[PDB]
């Protein structure tokens, strides 16, 4: 067999190393252990003992505030992988708060299952440009390593392998340089191909059976494995429990007697916080699903025909949701007799997990809350959520409170996402990328939006850096040149045409013809879409303006496609009357042109009658080039040559290889005639370099004056 140890569950290593007598002979792990809380220690204590009997881990391991403790390869060599059945705030391993930590070991690791590791604030550590994690993780997006001695920029890290003694060294470039992939200055790392990476390479032979994992004491032997991807029973990794046996916590099978007494030890006159394990799904799992309960002694769960909701009365009358840990603490809860809060962080998405964890939940007894969820985008993982009933509210009768979400831009498609925010208010500020119309749909599905009030929702925000809108622009005519282009499109008059002030145009180069469908990130400008505005046209004709809008772009490279779209620019609204309007983008070529100059000619021969002429294209090759016209003659006979080079005069003064005059003579007219015209070209000039504030004020002032005039004169009588 491969897994001989005794059941040795979690324990805290704290304030005395004598606790390793709980590791008297152990090799098995369940739950987690905690290596910390040892201040008066030094290498004697970590050389007083070293207990290499271990097998592997399941959940995680921990490191915190212990001095010395140079590395781990001496401590726990026989230690294979972690299963990540649990986590520690979206991480499955910790490296934190160590002093005199020379290196680490862990040259025995092949596939970390879930989550990531955490390295931080251990300022005496290096040799970590030789350790890949994608090759040890089936998913790498959330891992986070920072603040060590390597962050001082030293430790050239001479690791051995192909260099310093051939020792079966698989180097593996991932970015542009191979590296002797290792763990220390005196160890190595084990690379696999995908032939057997699923269930592991082995230089013993070349692979293992495809139900082993990690390593195997014999290549191609389904019992001499070291790790198991799926299951375990009687000395061999497997992929199923045969059905007199039953499954418990992703790491084994046991017999029905085992699971029933592994419960019934606690089914006695002493509460020890234990849990109500029952057979189900061919799986000795903790509790019963919905439409499943167990009030009997048949020892299997059974469906209440009615709903068996997964009610879970919160502690504290509340709860924060901050991590996958807090999330998993409710997977297999559906109803919440409490109130949740969602305060997520980090540049990492979690809707995948929460749609596994929260993607069943349907009824919060109280209220939702949202708070500075940076990387979040949606309520998408909330896909069964219906009833935020009116029985609990935050300060100010709020039934809903979202804020500081710098990336939220859409909740649902509202196909049949039938919910009810039955009572209570909303709250929305600093919610930029979310449209307003979607909030209006939320108030519509809600019910009485009359519950709302002034400033319950923001209007200066929530669609800032981009937004959907209600109405669209269209075009009437376009005309182009090689150096210039025209656009003339439809005019738009809001119901109070004074409220409008011009059109906002956008364009750019775009050889890649699938560019962003984006409004524009004009945060101090900072987006290379060269934008310029335009004064609006007149109200000349009362039914329909015979003058269409227009502004002429110009100075563009010839034979260059160009995306171009525009959008309104409107007075800051007061009620939900309009979202302005926009145009879609148009990839637009630039017309052909005659004058482009090829570059860098050549003039040398292989023979006298021969000449090798070579050259380059222009800076403006101007699209499809037909061919390269050429001329040449005996243009070599000036009068500058029959009357030179006498006896005492210079011998070979007119020895003009690459003759002077035909060459491009120097120049100094940088910008004088038609480029002082284009002299508002500039640098450090913003893309919103205009105090429109003053102009907004001017427009509002003119409106005030005219409104005052008309509303005075209009009716000084009842008739």
């Amino acid at each position: 067999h491969l897994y001989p140890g005794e059941v040795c569950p979690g324990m805290d290593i704290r304030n005395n190393l004598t606790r390793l007598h709980e590791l008297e002979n152990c090799s098995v792990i369940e739950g987690h252990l905690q290596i910390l809380l040892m201040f008066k220690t030094r290498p004697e204590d970590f050389r007083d003992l070293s207990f290499p009997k271990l097998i592997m881990i399941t959940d995680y391991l921990l490191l915190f505030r212990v001095y010395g403790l140079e590395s781990l390869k001496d401590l726990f060599p026989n230690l294979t992988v972690i299963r990540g059945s649990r986590l520690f705030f979206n991480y499955a391993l910790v490296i934190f708060e160590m002093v005199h930590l020379k290196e680490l070991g862990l040259y025995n690791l092949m596939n970390i299952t879930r989550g990531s590791v955490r390295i931080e604030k251990n300022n005496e550590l290096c040799y970590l440009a030789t350790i890949d994690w994608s090759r040890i993780l089936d998913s790498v997006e959330d891992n986070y390593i920072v603040l060590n001695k390597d962050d001082n920029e030293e430790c050239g890290d001479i690791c051995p392998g192909t260099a310093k003694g051939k020792t079966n060294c698989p180097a593996t470039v991932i970015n542009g340089q191979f590296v002797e992939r290792c763990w220390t200055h005196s160890h190595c790392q084990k690379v696999c191909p995908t032939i057997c990476k699923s269930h592991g390479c082995t230089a013993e032979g070349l692979c293992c059976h495809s139900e082993c994992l990690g390593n195997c004491s014999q290549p191609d032997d389904p019992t001499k494995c070291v790790a198991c991807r799926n299951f375990y029973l009687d000395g061999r990794c497997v992929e199923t429990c045969p059905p007199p046996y039953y499954h418990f916590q992703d790491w084994r099978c046991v017999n029905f007697s085992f699971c029933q007494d592994l419960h019934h030890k606690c089914k006695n006159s002493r509460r020890q916080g234990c849990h109500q394990y029952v057979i189900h799904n061919n799986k000795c799992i903790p509790e019963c699903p919905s439409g499943y309960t167990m009030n009997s002694s048949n020892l299997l769960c059974t469906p209440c025909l009615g709903p068996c909701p997964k009610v879970c009365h919160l502690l504290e009358g509340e709860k924060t949701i901050d991590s996958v840990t807090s999330a998993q603490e409710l997977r297999g809860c559906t109803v919440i007799n409490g109130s949740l809060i969602i305060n997520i962080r980090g540049g990492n998405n979690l809707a995948a997990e929460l749609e596994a964890n929260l993607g069943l939940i349907e009824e919060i007894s109280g209220y939702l809350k949202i708070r500075r969820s940076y990387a979040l985008v949606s309520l998408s993982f909330f896909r069964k959520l219906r009833l935020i009933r009116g029985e609990t509210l935050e300060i100010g009768n709020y039934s809903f409170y979202a804020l500081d979400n710098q990336n939220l831009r859409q909740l649902w498609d509202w196909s049949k996402h039938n919910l009810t925010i039955t009572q209570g208010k909303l709250f929305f500020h600093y919610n930029p990328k979310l449209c307003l119309s979607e909030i209006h749909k939320m108030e519509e599905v809600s019910g009485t939006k009359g519950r709302q009030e002034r400033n319950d929702i923001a209007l200066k925000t929530n669609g800032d850096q981009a937004s959907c809108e209600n109405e669209l622009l269209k075009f009437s005519y376009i005309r182009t040149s090689f150096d210039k282009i025209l656009l003339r499109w439809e005019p738009y008059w809001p119901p109070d045409f004074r409220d409008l002030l011009g059109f906002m145009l956008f364009y750019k180069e775009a050889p890649y013809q699938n560019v962003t469908e984006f409004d524009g990130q004009d945060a101090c400008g900072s987006n290379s879409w060269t934008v310029v505005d335009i004064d609006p046209p007149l109200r000349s004709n009362d039914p329909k303006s015979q003058n269409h809008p227009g502004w002429l772009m110009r100075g563009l490279k010839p034979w260059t496609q160009y995306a171009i779209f525009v959008k309104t620019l409107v007075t800051f609204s007061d009620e939900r009357r309009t979202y302005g309007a926009k145009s879609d983008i148009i990839y637009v070529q630039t017309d052909a042109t005659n004058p482009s100059v090829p570059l860098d000619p050549i003039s040398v021969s292989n023979s006298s009658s021969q000449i090798i002429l070579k050259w380059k294209p222009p800076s403006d090759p101007n699209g499809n080039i037909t061919h390269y016209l050429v001329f040449w003659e005996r243009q070599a006979e000036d009068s500058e040559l029959f009357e030179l080079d006498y006896c005492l005069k210079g011998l070979k003064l007119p020895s003009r290889t690459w003759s002077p005059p035909f060459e491009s003579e120097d120049s100094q007219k940088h910008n004088q005639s038609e480029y002082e015209d284009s002299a508002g070209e500039c640098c450090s000039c913003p893309k919103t370099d205009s105090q429109i504030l003053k102009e907004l004020e001017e427009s509002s002032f003119r409106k005030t004056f005219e409104d005052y005039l008309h509303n005075v004169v209009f009716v000084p009588r009842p008739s």
Partner: peptide, 30 residues
């Protein structure tokens, strides 16, 4: 008259073409 919302010079001219002659007034008599 337009069934669009009337404002500004558009309003002025439309209003004159509506009432026209001897209809519309400033009344300091009131």
């Amino acid at each position: 008259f337009v069934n669009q919302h009337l404002c500004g010079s558009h309003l002025v001219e439309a209003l004159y073409l509506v009432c026209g002659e001897r209809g519309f007034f400033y009344t300091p008599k009131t």
